[model samples]
Target: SMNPPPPETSNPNKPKRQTNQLQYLLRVVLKTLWKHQFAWPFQQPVDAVKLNLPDYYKIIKTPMDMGTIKKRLENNYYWNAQECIQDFNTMFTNCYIYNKPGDDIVLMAEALEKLFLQKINELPTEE
Candidate 1:
């Protein structure tokens, strides 16, 4: 289910609420996601010419990468942490679909996906 409606509706006179718990956790986890050794492959969109995979766009309908995810996070485009995390899942799943099971890029995607899942699970919701 989607998150409940935001507690405080927009009011020009009111100070912004400190209800961005999910956003803060996402930022922290996102930093870790970017810092991981395997993060290089996911930092940006796949380049068809560089990798010589002309059919990439055809197979992966939704192309996702850390840069785009980061920009969305910064723009407040996600409704909750789950939506942000789902983008990462799509990124790794795309790699899996485009590469062979034993490929190095596939390994990298596996590692990064595991890292994201682990980090996301550890975040406390009490904040």
Candidate 2:
């Protein structure tokens, strides 16, 4: 059988640390937390429905007569606008499906902020 590789050597100037068990465990915890936290778009589909105008998030400037631009993250995968263009076109080509009444703009806006926007804002934006 072939011989094993040489042992890894730490930097001489650095302390005898950084890759020890506690350090490794801390990194594991931090990495796990990092995966759970992200600076993702804070808009939700329900808020999208409530806004009714579409593209309220302002990530894309002019939304359209149809619907706003939307980014989808599904099955642990992230799909950008270009890749989702066809799906978007298909969605926007339908009827005016946002059923929330826009009669009370002031009243409704505040209510919706709680219903949808608050939690989205509350979700941690960093690791």
Candidate 3:
């Protein structure tokens, strides 16, 4: 038997929902951090319907793409961009300079600076 198809989506004529500048900046920061840590492109494959089955499964099972990190940063993390940058700078300085640690100082510095810069650039500015 033939049945009526689902109704078409209504066009509400409402204004587009604009993302908060701070939220956008946070997303960029989180995405950059993910890329730096995983050394891979931070594509949101789950948003794409054309991804292959294997690729989809890989993304689903990968801990790297977990939403908790983004959620925690968005909902719970307290530091603003400047504060985050300062905190990272202090930590890096203490660990690599004052403490004379054995960690990967160069990579850590590079990643931290790159994410900070990306976040700063992403912020909306008034002319």
**Candidate number achieving the greatest lDDT relative to the actual structure:** 1
Q: Please, what is the whole-model Cα lDDT of each candidate in the order they appear?
A: 0.71, 0.28, 0.42
Give the C-alpha miss distance for residue 62 in model 3, angstroms: 31
Per-residue lDDT of candidate 2, residues 40-61 (tens digit): 1222222444445444433332
Clash count for each candidate, listed in order shown: 0, 0, 0
Residue 37 accuracy (lDDT) in model 2:
24
Cα error, residue 101 of model 2, in Å, equals 13
* Candidate 1 C-alpha lDDT tens digits along 1-127: 1222221213345333233555664567788889888898788777666677667776877778887787666556665666667887888888888889899989898887888778777766744
The deviation in Å at residue 6 for candidate 2 is: 59
User: Which stretch of 10 consecutive residues in model 2 shows the poorest summed lDDT?
Assistant: 65-74
Clashing pairs in 2: none
Better of 2 and 3 by TM-score: 3
Candidate RMSDs in Å, in order, are 8.6, 19.2, 14.0
Candidate 2 TM-score, true structure as reference? 0.21
What does the lDDT come to for candidate 1? 0.71
Stretch of 10 with least lDDT, candidate 3: 1-10
| Model 3 steric clash pairs | none
